């Protein structure tokens, strides 16, 4: 029995960037329904099991969306925006040139995601379940940061990626605050809401996940 956790901030704490009315419907109605329907059909293990190597089982849409929204609420904070630091900034500059270049590519991906979906910053340290898929001599640059778009409920977990940041591009996430203006919603997300300390924290776990596999 999975439970709907509240966001780590008060529902009025994202004003004026994200209104309480949006949070009342996005979390109180959409996210709540995903958890309620998931419990009738029965979290990371559930998402992988219900994905079923592409032949998605009935529980996948509820399970993946429930995980996605919980990940989404932790990706933002009332005093977000700015720039990251530490190893995250070093990796961003290594794989995107500079932080400014990364922001433009991330915004463009979120803008061009057609229909309902999610845009992810992920740490790519995947392993494949096929034969002759192991590199004898890894170069240590193969574990890199990537920007990936997914439709509907899909998340990078189904390809054994490590998500670090996401933005919800379903229209219900921004229509009460920006109507059709998704560009302004994306720009507001990266300048006022994004929590880089949470993204940095998730990077450490992803790095440790790869380190444990290599030993």
């Amino acid at each position: 029995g999975f439970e709907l956790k509240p966001p780590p901030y008060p529902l009025d704490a994202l004003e004026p960037h994200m209104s309480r009315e949006t949070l009342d419907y996005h979390w109180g109605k959409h996210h709540k329904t995903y958890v309620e329907n998931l419990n009738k059909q029965i979290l990371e293990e559930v998402v992988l099991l219900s994905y079923n190597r592409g032949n998605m089982l009935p529980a996948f849409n509820n399970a993946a969306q429930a995980w996605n929204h919980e990940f989404f609420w932790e990706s933002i904070q009332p005093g977000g925006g700015g720039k990251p630091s530490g190893d995250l900034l070093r990796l961003i500059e290594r794989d995107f040139g500079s932080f400014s270049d990364f922001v433009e590519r991330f915004k463009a991906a979120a803008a061009s995601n057609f229909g309902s979906g999610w845009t992810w910053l992920a740490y790519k340290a995947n392993r494949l379940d096929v034969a002759n898929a192991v590199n004898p001599l890894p170069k240590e640059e193969d574990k890199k940061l990537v920007i990936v778009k997914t439709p509907n409920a899909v998340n990078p977990l189904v390809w054994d990626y490590s998500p670090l940041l996401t933005i919800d591009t379903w229209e219900h996430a921004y229509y009460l605050d920006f109507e059709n203006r998704r560009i302004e919603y994306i720009n507001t997300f990266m300048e006022k809401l994004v929590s880089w300390e949470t993204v940095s924290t998730r990077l450490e776990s992803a790095m440790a996940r790869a380190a444990q596999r290599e030993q």
Binding site: S112, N113, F114, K149, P151
Partner: protein
């Protein structure tokens, strides 16, 4: 027939790519593939963007008597589900990137 192979097989080509377009695509971060005189059969399972840096390749679709020729400086997009033989007759070098649905 009268219709060129590029039109029939939906092989988008952008011969003589400007440097600005290369940087917009981020070609400098693409992986490198090279070969000598050989023949490569392949069936594309996803779209592939190829920027040829040196040499030339002649692409013969499955069952075809004609070929498509791409030279250094051309940007080629091989479509998904394409089956062809790639022929090389000299040193060849390229930078490639595979594209899933949407992406680019």
């Amino acid at each position: 027939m009268q219709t060129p192979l590029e039109e029939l097989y939906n092989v988008k080509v952008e011969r003589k790519v400007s440097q600005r377009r290369l940087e917009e695509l981020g070609v400098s971060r693409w992986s490198v593939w090279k070969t000598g005189k050989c023949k490569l059969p392949w069936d594309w399972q996803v779209d592939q963007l190829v920027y040829i840096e040196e040499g030339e390749v002649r692409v013969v679709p499955e069952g075809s008597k004609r070929f498509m020729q791409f030279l250094a400086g051309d940007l080629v997009r091989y479509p998904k589900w394409l089956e062809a033989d790639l022929f090389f007759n000299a040193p060849y070098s390229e930078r490639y990137c595979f594209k899933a649905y949407a992406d680019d």
